[PDB]
């Protein structure tokens, strides 16, 4: 599939002939090296980046996450009070949203690419937004989202979580972290787990913070082009 | 007259080089905090490397805005060609 | 020529209060750095500082664009009628 995608330019087929793979076999036998190498490979080189990720992840630590598990089955005593979460699981429709928010986050570890783990953790976030929205009959507020997410990680135990989150950070293309969700939902997961070991509001507010200025940035990045053209586009009418 | 124009230039240029040095001191304390970001512990690499992507996206927009200004002006130059 | 003299004083004064302003900034950066050397959750608040710094810059760029539009707008008006 990656071969058929690369074929149909031929410079992408030169990337098919290029394969960093032998260099990976060399440097990764002694962990932080392969992260910088993959990031360098991505920096040197358009959806073919996701296809190269799709290949390299399918082919190419991952242990000791227990500390979370013991701490989660610990935190079993925690009720949606003091998480102040807007989720009322009595109504069937939200209980069904919660269940498959969890089902998603479980499904993550099973996944192929880091990006496909990212796809999972969006849908988890989306179902969380649904659980909240159906509860209060009103769209979730950003301050609501983060706690509710932990609650989904706090009950139900995704196989090998910290393994997953370190693996995604290691390689996936940080063209990720700019505008778009899967990485905003990601950084929310990080904030979630990091919080779990004993403020929340700060973590929510800070995520809102960064996400906005990145929205505004990708706007101004455009309006520059819009203005540039609009004036050039028009200086030459007459 | 010349006198207070000789001494004020002295004091003004001494104020400028002091001010500009202070700014650099500030920019170094800032960079130090940017270097306090990534470490072994209490990380959330996620948040840190978000804040990175942000400020990296803005420091291109300065080349963007500058070049937006110089490219609009080069268009003005051809409107000057109109005659 | 007191034209210069009176402008030099103005520029000197402006450089001074602006410098003091640069200093209060430097000071609090120092006061911030001296505390919680590691792991106090003060480097989350360091991340919000990087936030606000990027938020003053983002806006400088925004208002910079809007003015650039006007300068070009009225300049275009000139080169039109002239």
Author numbering:
A (entry chain A): 141 to 148, 150 to 160, 163 to 173, 175 to 189, 205 to 219, 231 to 368, 391 to 430
B (entry chain C): 553 to 635
C (entry chain B): 553 to 634
Paper text:
In this process, small GTPase Rab5 functions as a master regulator of the early endosomal biogenesis. Rabaptin-5 is a key effector of Rab5 and plays an important role in both homotypic and heterotypic fusions of early endosomes. The GEF activity of Rabex-5 is autoinhibited by its CC domain and is activated by the binding of Rabaptin-5 via its C2-1 domain.
On the other hand, in the structure of the R2Δ complex, Rabaptin-5C212 forms 2 two-helix bundles with a V-shaped conformation, and Rabex-5CC interacts via the nonpolar surface with the C-terminal regions of Rabaptin-5C212 to form a tight three-helix bundle. It packs in parallel with the C-terminal α-helices of Rabaptin-5C212 to form a tight three-helix bundle with its nonpolar surface buried in a hydrophobic surface groove of Rabaptin-5C212. The GEF domain packs along the three-helix bundle formed by Rabex-5CC and Rabaptin-5C212. The interaction interface buries a total of solvent accessible surface area of 1040 Å2, which is much smaller than that between Rabex-5 and Rab21 (2400 Å2). Hence, we consider that the substrate-binding site of Rabex-5 is largely exposed to the solvent and partially accessible by the substrate. In the structure of the R2Δ complex, the substrate-binding site of Rabex-5 is partially occupied by Rabex-5CC and Rabaptin-5C212, implying that further conformational change(s) of the R2Δ complex will be required to bind Rab5.
